[PDB]
């Protein structure tokens, strides 16, 4: 017996976290937006005895997790995954910022009140909350877990990218500020800060033409045409399966108490992804562009070093690499259209 609450459980990472949690025989209560969502989640796993679901139509509102904490006082672990990953933002602070910040409070306020036997808590943040624009481009720099993105609130408002990056920064700020501004904090907080999350969905069932994931970075490649220009993008990446695992080690492991945990397997550009696909998918070579080896040089010259040694030590397992992650992503999308 050992109960774990996971919010927004139909999400890309969360669904992996759920699979792995269930495989280690935890009891899992996931929250979902709708009744439809919930019943779909249970059917995907063929209704195990150790998996239930509660409905939180909006994780951000005041008291959003009030009923479930009171109805499930046996739980000890809270994994928070839900956050608007995109919208069509007409106003950053209304649509995006203040939700992330005043919403993260209305999760922790809910737990400080009614999460009585809750001991370990894990929030999913981002590498975008760690790295600053100027630093991330410094080839000579070394960004670690202590680094904070120094973006202003006024800067977060300029556009939706600054918006999203700002939401991550100010929301995780709020989460530590909470455990410092309250007295008998009965739980400990760990945080998972990934770069771009690649990898397959938990179930090939769920594949749609455009994946509501950062694996749309990859998918966008497959919608290119041979004579098309390759859209520039780059940064760190990590596999959804290692990210999900990290969330579990975050409360299983005691050294994880009060830790920011950087999740990053390596670095990519779009050339990296093209190369890997053309190389390993013969039924696609000649149906998308080229220019091989660009990445190596671009990465060496235009990106800092992510030093996540302290994170990779704490976690202690080995990561998927780019070839395998990209492969599993694409192999899954191919074998879904038919
Ligand atoms: N994905 C990446 O590459 C990166 C991810 N992150 C972090 O990863 C976390 C998980 O996103 P991911 O799982 O990666 O991809 P998803 O976008 O698939 O996760 C989205 C999930 O969050 C739920 N959700 C979002 N806002 C609300 C809300 N206001 N009320 C209720 N449910 C909500 C959705 O519910 P429904 O599906 O029912 O609408 C969905 O299940 C995010 O919090 C983000 O900060 C950080 C850096 C990069």
Describe the structure.
With 338 residues, the chain is an alpha/beta fold. 41% of the residues lie in helices and 15% in strands. The structure holds NADPH dihydro-nicotinamide-adenine-dinucleotide phosphate. NADPH dihydro-nicotinamide-adenine-dinucleotide phosphate is lined by residues 8, 10-14, 32-33, 37, 58-60, 81-85, 124, 126, 128, 168, 194, 196-197, 212-214.
What attributes characterize this protein structure?
15% strand, 338 residues, globular, monomer, 13 helices, alpha/beta, three-stranded mixed sheet, binds NADPH dihydro-nicotinamide-adenine-dinucleotide phosphate, seven-stranded parallel sheet
Count of the separate structural domains: 1
Bound molecules: NADPH dihydro-nicotinamide-adenine-dinucleotide phosphate
Characterize the overall form: globular
The percent of residues in helical segments reads 40-55%
What oligomeric state do these chains adopt?
monomer
Strand content: 15-25%
How many strands, which pairing sense, and closed or not: the largest β-sheet?
Answer: 7 strands, parallel
Distance between the termini: 42 Å
Widest beta sheet: strand line-up:
3-2-1-4-5-7-10
What is the CA-based Rg, rounded? 20 Å
Care to count the β-strands?
Answer: 12
Q: How many helical elements?
A: 13
What's the helix-strand series? Answer: EHEHEHEHEHEHHEEHEHEEHHEHH
PDB class: oxidoreductase
Keywords: NADPH, oxidoreductase
Assembly: monomeric
Entry title: Crystal structure of Gre2 in complex with NADPH complex from Candida albicans
């Amino acid at each position: 017996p050992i109960t774990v609450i996971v919010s927004g459980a139909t999400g890309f990472i969360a669904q992996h976290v759920v699979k792995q949690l269930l495989a280690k025989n935890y009891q899992v209560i996931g929250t979902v937006r709708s009744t439809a969502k919930g019943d779909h989640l249970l059917k995907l796993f063929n209704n195990p005895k150790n998996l239930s679901y509660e409905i939180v139509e909006d994780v951000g509102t005041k008291g959003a997790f009030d009923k479930v904490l009171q109805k499930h006082g046996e739980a000890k672990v809270f994994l928070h995954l839900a956050s608007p990953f995109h919208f069509n933002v007409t106003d950053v602070e209304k649509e995006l910022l203040l939700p992330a910040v005043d919403g993260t409070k209305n999760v922790l306020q809910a737990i400080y009140n009614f999460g009585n036997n809750i001991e370990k808590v894990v929030i999913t943040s981002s590498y975008a909350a760690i790295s600053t624009a100027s630093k991330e481009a410094d080839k000579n720099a070394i960004i670690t877990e202590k680094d904070w993105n120094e973006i202003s609130w006024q800067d977060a408002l300029l556009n939706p990218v600054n918006g999203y990056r700002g939401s991550k920064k100010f929301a995780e700020k709020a989460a530590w500020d909470f455990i410092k501004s309250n007295d008998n904090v009965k739980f400990s907080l760990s945080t998972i800060n990934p770069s771009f999350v690649f990898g397959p969905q938990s179930f090939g069932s769920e594949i749609k033409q455009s994946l509501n994931t950062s694996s749309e970075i990859i998918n966008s490649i497959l919608k290119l045409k041979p004579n098309d220009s390759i859209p520039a993008s780059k940064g760190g990446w990590v596999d959804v399966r290692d990210v999900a695992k990290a969330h579990i080690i975050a409360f299983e492991n005691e050294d994880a108490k009060n830790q920011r945990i950087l999740l990053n397997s390596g670095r990519f550009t779009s050339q990296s992804l093209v190369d890997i696909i053309n190389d390993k998918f013969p039924d696609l070579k000649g149906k998308i562009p080229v220019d091989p080896g660009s990445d190596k040089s671009v990465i060496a010259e235009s990106l800092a070093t992510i030093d996540d040694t302290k994170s990779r030590e704490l976690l202690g397992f080995e990561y998927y690499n780019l070839e395998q992650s990209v492969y599993d992503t694409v192999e899954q999308i191919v074998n879904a259209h038919k």
